[PDB]
A paper describes a structure:
One such enzyme is 2-hydroxyacyl-CoA lyase/synthase (HACL/S), which catalyzes the reversible cleavage of 2-hydroxyacyl-CoA (2hcCoA) into formyl-CoA (fCoA) and an aldehyde or ketone. Originally identified in the mammalian α-oxidation pathway of 3-methyl-branched fatty acids, HACL/S has demonstrated remarkable catalytic reversibility, as it is capable of condensing fCoA with various substrates covering a wide range of aldehydes and ketones with different carbon chain lengths. All the enzymes are tetramers, specifically dimers of dimers (α2), where α2 dimer represents a catalytical unit. The three domains have specific functions: the N-terminal domain binds the pyrimidine of [name] (PYR), the middle domain has a regulatory function (R) and binds ADP, and the C-terminal domain binds the pyrophosphoryl group (PP) of [name].
The α2 interface hosts the ligand binding and catalytic sites that are well-conserved among [name]-dependent lyases. The overall structural analysis is based on highest resolution structures (1.70 Å TbHACL/S and 1.85 Å CcHACL/S), unless indicated otherwise. The most unique variant is CcHACL/S, showing a clear preference for C3 over C2, and no activity on C1 substrate at all. C1 substrate may be too small to interact with this surface. Curiously, this variant clusters in close proximity with the OXC sub-family, which shows clear preference on C1 and C2 over C3 aldehydes. Comparison of active site structures and ligand binding for [name]/L and ApbHACL/S shows relatively small differences but comparison with AcHICL/S shows much larger differences consistent with variations in substrate specificity and kinetic rates. All structures contain well-defined bound [name] and ADP.
Residue numbers in the entry:
A (entry chain A), B (entry chain B): 6 to 543
C (entry chain C): 5 to 543
Write the structure that this text describes.
Amino acid sequence: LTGSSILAKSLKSLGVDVIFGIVGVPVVEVAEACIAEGIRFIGCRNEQSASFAAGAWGYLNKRPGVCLTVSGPGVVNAISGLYNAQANCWPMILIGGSCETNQIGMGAFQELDQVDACRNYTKFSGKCADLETIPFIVNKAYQVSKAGRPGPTYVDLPADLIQATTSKLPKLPEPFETPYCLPHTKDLSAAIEILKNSKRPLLVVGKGATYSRCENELKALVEEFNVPFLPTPMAKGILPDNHSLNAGSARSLALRKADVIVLLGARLNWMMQFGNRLNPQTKIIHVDISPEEFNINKKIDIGLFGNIPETIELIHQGLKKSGKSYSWIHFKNELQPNIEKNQEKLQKFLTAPLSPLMNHQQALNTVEEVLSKQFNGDYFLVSEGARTMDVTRMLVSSHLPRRRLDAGTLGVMGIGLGYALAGQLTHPDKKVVAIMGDSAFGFSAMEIETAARCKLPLIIIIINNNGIYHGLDDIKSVPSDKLPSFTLMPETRYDLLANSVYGQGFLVKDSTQLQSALQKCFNFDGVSIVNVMIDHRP
Amino acid sequence: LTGSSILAKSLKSLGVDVIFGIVGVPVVEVAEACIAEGIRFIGCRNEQSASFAAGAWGYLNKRPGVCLTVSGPGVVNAISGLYNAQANCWPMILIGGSCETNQIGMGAFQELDQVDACRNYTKFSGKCADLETIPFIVNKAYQVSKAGRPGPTYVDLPADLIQATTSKLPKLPEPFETPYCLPHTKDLSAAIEILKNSKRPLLVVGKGATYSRCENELKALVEEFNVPFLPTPMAKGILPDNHSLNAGSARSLALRKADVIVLLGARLNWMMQFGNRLNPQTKIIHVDISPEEFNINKKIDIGLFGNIPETIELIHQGLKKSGKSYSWIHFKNELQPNIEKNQEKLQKFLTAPLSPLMNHQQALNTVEEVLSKQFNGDYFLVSEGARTMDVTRMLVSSHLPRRRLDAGTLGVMGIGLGYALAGQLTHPDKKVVAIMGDSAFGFSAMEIETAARCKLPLIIIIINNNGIYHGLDDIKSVPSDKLPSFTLMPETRYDLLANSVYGQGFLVKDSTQLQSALQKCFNFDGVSIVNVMIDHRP
Amino acid sequence: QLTGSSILAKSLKSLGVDVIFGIVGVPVVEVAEACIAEGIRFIGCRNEQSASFAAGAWGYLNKRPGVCLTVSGPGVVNAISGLYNAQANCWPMILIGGSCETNQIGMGAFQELDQVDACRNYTKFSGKCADLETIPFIVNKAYQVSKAGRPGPTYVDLPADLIQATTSKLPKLPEPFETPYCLPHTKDLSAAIEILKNSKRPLLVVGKGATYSRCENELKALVEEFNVPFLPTPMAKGILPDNHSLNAGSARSLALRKADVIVLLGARLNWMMQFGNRLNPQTKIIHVDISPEEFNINKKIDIGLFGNIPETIELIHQGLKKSGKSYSWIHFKNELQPNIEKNQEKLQKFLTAPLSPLMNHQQALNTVEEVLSKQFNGDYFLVSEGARTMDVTRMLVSSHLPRRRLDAGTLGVMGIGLGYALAGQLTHPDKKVVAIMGDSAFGFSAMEIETAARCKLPLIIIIINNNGIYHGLDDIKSVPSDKLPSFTLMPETRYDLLANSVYGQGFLVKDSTQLQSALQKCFNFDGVSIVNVMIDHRP
Ligand SMILES: Nc1ncnc2c1ncn2[C@@H]1O[C@H](COP(=O)(O)OP(=O)(O)O)[C@@H](O)[C@H]1O
Ligand SMILES: Nc1ncnc2c1ncn2[C@@H]1O[C@H](COP(=O)(O)OP(=O)(O)O)[C@@H](O)[C@H]1O
Ligand SMILES: Nc1ncnc2c1ncn2[C@@H]1O[C@H](COP(=O)(O)OP(=O)(O)O)[C@@H](O)[C@H]1O
Ligand SMILES: Cc1ncc(C[n+]2csc(CCOP(=O)(O)OP(=O)(O)O)c2C)c(N)n1
Ligand SMILES: Cc1ncc(C[n+]2csc(CCOP(=O)(O)OP(=O)(O)O)c2C)c(N)n1
Ligand SMILES: Cc1ncc(C[n+]2csc(CCOP(=O)(O)OP(=O)(O)O)c2C)c(N)n1
Ligand SMILES: [Cl-]
Ligand SMILES: [Cl-]
Ligand SMILES: [Mg+2]
Ligand SMILES: [Mg+2]
Ligand SMILES: [Mg+2]
């Protein structure tokens, strides 16, 4: 028994079956011990992507993802994923090797107080003091990351413990089911009365709801009482985007005109403009597991402190108790004229003359037609970029829960390939399509070798406008000192990157090439990159 | 006048001429304001590389490099380069946009306390409170980064200031020459007397000595009195690797046998094994600008608190005053049998059977022959990896000061392309060769597009053994759960990445093809990638 | 046969530590007792605030780190006040904190706190002893770092499992190492000399970095050979006497504004100098400091002299001697005489103010100065703390010797009064320590009178009592409790009677005659004396 194998056995007793990371001094022994215990190891090319993958994996699987890094710069690179998981409220454990304990203060190799470096990004950050305490620290990180509001944790394994030996196996952690809570009956009763008296109720469904896996309870409630709902971006698909009660296509109007809003796992942070655009007379019912979230940015009527799935059901039962036959389809019907105006605005983009290239909307509309016909809603989507991501949110539909990851609460670029790895590993029998802007893609592009090596046959679609929001179409005549900050190199051949990893690449300039390229990606055993050149202009 | 242009005018008045970064919300207007003031902007593909480039550029240029990032995850990604510059003692300024000030606490877009996030990685971290204080904060970061022991600083620009306008130009910073200091005369005289009584003195020359640009003084001293010297890795070349007084080829014996060691800008940290292998009877003279560095890890005899170049010259004048002539060539000559024994050990690697692929030594010995014939030492070298870096240090020689950058005090992977950009921008008339392991390369490989776009014709040599220290030559038959953590995909075709950016790539498997490929890189107007497949075994 | 306690103690003793301030508990009492067994005196205080304040002041006074010892958790948190103080003042000290058992971290251990992190932003070095063999390295690093360069506080963490661990092998103990200093570059030095050579109105601004570095003899030689006007900051008062013929302190504002050259000697252009904002932009500034990050930040300077203050003064002096010109800048001091007289007339207006029937601040402190002047002729030790009390003490109570004055300093912190007095009395057992404090200031640390009585430190405490913070009420009996003003304390609180709690002597004083009589009884008393001086309560 070594520090490595006790760490590995502790993770194994808690059900960990895949770890992302990059090895070296001193943690290669830790990774090989985990593999020796039957835990798969996904070696990445940058710890940014490894720690993004771990966080997304935790969100998808409702249990902590695990990331493993070397000391010093390994952990510092992974702070990007700690910050990401903390913002997204996603469970994960970052395990970092650290320098020899008795060399701290001497300028040890990759010396860093890594517990302190991670403390403000995590719900728990701690160091294994000795071999006997390894299970305790691992278990504490595991339990804490998944409890209450989920988030990341940090576990430090100093070099002198990794290679330390013992003959006595410390008591290993045993699984513990996360206890949850329910709203107080008084609050739940008041919220039920608010809904009963409402004329225009609106369920706002966030990624806390999809994480908690409330899709069945939400569907039963929405469909029995015709309750309009509106998903946040990663909640798209919890019910299909084309569901008859989905108000997503009239988002701004539905929010302004609703007289009751039920927030289901969604915060009134920047994504909801802090609640500033809500009618002050709207009554707000907030369902969250973090009680510190209630009545901060915006006055709310009722805070329902409880688990989303059971809370939906309790509200649904409350409405059934009266025996009355509530229906709010009228509110959804009232949003129909605004939905048709928004559709008419989209059509103007779709019929714009070719430049001779397509614009964002024309390219992504073709993608949606192709993907819809091939998969009928059953695949996995990763979405990242600026204009590429917003247009993908409008045009590329979701039909199942937790089949969509995007830049999230941070609006972080660089999650594309890590999230796609996590998605493919969670759904080995499904196709994973990652739709990325050309700028976004360059943050994590080298993980295509990780995907190829780990037999993850990703489909990568790059919407390429030669820069950030827009670009130049010729830089050879621009004096280098005056090269604008937003442009990338015109017609960068991201498609040819696929050949470095024995994949397949396609350069696409028109809808015919786009359709034909995508048809060749559906059954390819490897990485496909579709590099779609679009109009560079703003 | 905006926050953006007051920032840009402040940097320009302090002589800033190039900035690395990535733009977005809310920092696009800042980069464009810098460009309008005549400051060149290098848009990168990940903030890791941009912040590594700024720190390298500061070291090479003896004034702070500048890195610009967006709020939240932009700054967090750049903490890797802060940590790196702090560890290397390199001057730089990280300029981060941040969220609207009156939205802190509300879950603003990319909300992060960025002053605090950067506080422990920097000599100064501060926020611009209003338009009037921007020059003060910029000037403070600039002066602090380069004073004393150099290091990184952080300047926060909130989004409400970036967009703020005024008609009053604040007083702009004026350049100020960094004050140096000299050792106390009593300590200097004691150090001179120690050297006069020495029989086997050794000058240990670190990258503080190259940063302070002491090559002229060092040469004069070494050659007049025949004083053996030993460079640390990035000090290689301060005098040529084949200089007749260079003890680098008998490094452990020279350190073991010296009766006096003069530490010139080098720490007794992990790179010197904390001084643990030095003879306890060896007298130690330590020249540093950081007095907190003296007499911590190892008992020393004299701390010379002073600027390295002037201190070398004062020691030299002190020896020259005595009239009695000094020559320590005998010490160097005593090292020759060990130099020879080390060359014969190297020769066993160079003549080892081919697999049919070369080993690290055979590949890099060929690279050195080709580079030496072409440039006669006059080029720029970046070196990154584990075995690849160690063998490059042994075999690829340096002949001029500050023409070599490697993984440094952190042993950090991922600095390769960022260091190459800074080196090429500092020496536009020289060739930049980056010798990277295959694992190392994957951390920063997408910056080849930055190099192509900004007209930086890098020559990239990848020493490819299919993984980290070693790899497998076949993963097709390995069950995915048992894939080892150290391996990468066999024969990943990094050479083909060059085609994505209209460069040129070469797959190379023997010394003949390596020489032929390298000869085609010397005058190519673009990025060249030579992918050298070597034996995968450990 | 050695323990963590004794390896720590022997490590401190080999580095010359001879006194430690602190408060013991679990398990650090074994550490203090091992220190006492090695010949190190332990000063047990009543609050860690005062202990850490005392350690920092002791460091300043003695030009070597003071040492503070506390228990885990709230012991260390209480001492962060003194770390912040020593950091702001640039004073060398080591805080030594016990911490919880290492293998209980994360479990909710008794007084569990990441104390290394807690102290990190307040210290130059914060570290933990990982095992018995590394105690000397950590202690030595804290000791060397605190005194090198710009001095400052450090933190050493001693976990409970280490305090109690035993070994039969003695680790190598630290050996003393003389702090290396630097000298300014010759180019900068020659440029500074040439600036001074061409000056008509030069001014040496002498700060507490100058007094810490002990440059009084070099400064005196330069000032007196060439008649160079100078101006001390509050704790530099006395480096040359307040009544030295070249002292411009009585015309501070005019001298600063009219100088054509300012030499800053261990003084910063921080809030205490209004950030340089009142200086004439045409004035040339020469800044002598050991922290190069200080140059050209708040204010444009001409020359940064990166070097040790005493040698740098001497090198400037020698540079002026080299020409053979008989430089004399007494004329600039003489130009300040109208302003000095105007300020003295302003003060005399306060001294002749009618009694109310109580004295005002100026009258009480002028009487104090008359008594102290007749009793000591300048040779005593002064601690000064308060708001108005402190400002009037600075104007009226004179200093005549270097490092004989401590006040609220860079933090303007209330609560240093008795800890500083303890350090001053321990540093000068052959001198009398007078602490002049406002009534509000005194209440922060007053219980340390028992520490002084217990440790045979015969402090003389003078409280200038106006019933509150800057001002007070003279009656609160008829004020409804909800409406009691925030600035007032209880009228005529009998701080003098506190002296009886520790077998000292106290005096209630309401006029200058009683003040004189009471003070005269304080100079030869074996114990603590407190003079409670009731003054006018109005603003
Ligand atoms: N099981 C659960 N029950 C209730 N609320 C939860 C649960 N898990 C997470 N949450 C909450 O869901 C919220 C997620 O909000 P956010 O990440 O802003 O979603 P979105 O970005 O989709 O609006 C967090 O406030 C979190 O506390
Ligand atoms: N101008 C200078 N004069 C003296 N010392 C310097 C100067 N600039 C930097 N230094 C010192 O040089 C040292 C660099 O050492 P280190 O980075 O460990 O070098 P290496 O890795 O080459 O051994 C630091 O201690 C730093 O304080
Ligand atoms: N030996 C020394 N040589 C030169 N400067 C020093 C020395 N010791 C301390 N200093 C400097 O003295 C200055 C003290 O300034 P400060 O505390 O503001 O003084 P004051 O409050 O009296 O104005 C600090 O900047 C510190 O770096
Ligand atoms: C880590 C990080 N760095 C920088 C940014 C700023 N940013 C926001 S979107 C974006 C890229 C936008 O370009 P692209 O992905 O090509 O999309 P487009 O809008 O051109 O379709 C960038 C760099 C960010 N959000 N995160
Ligand atoms: C940021 C970071 N992550 C991980 C490591 C661990 N590490 C050390 S060397 C190395 C790469 C070794 O492989 P390669 O560059 O191919 O060199 P080889 O030894 O195979 O020649 C890695 C990942 C590191 N030093 N820094
Ligand atoms: C630790 C701390 N708490 C509070 C303050 C605020 N403060 C400044 S001066 C002062 C006391 C002023 O009253 P006193 O000491 O009686 O003097 P007076 O001006 O009334 O003569 C206080 C509380 C401080 N400086 N430090
Ligand atoms: Cl745009
Ligand atoms: Cl190996
Ligand atoms: Mg784009
Ligand atoms: Mg390799
Ligand atoms: Mg008062």
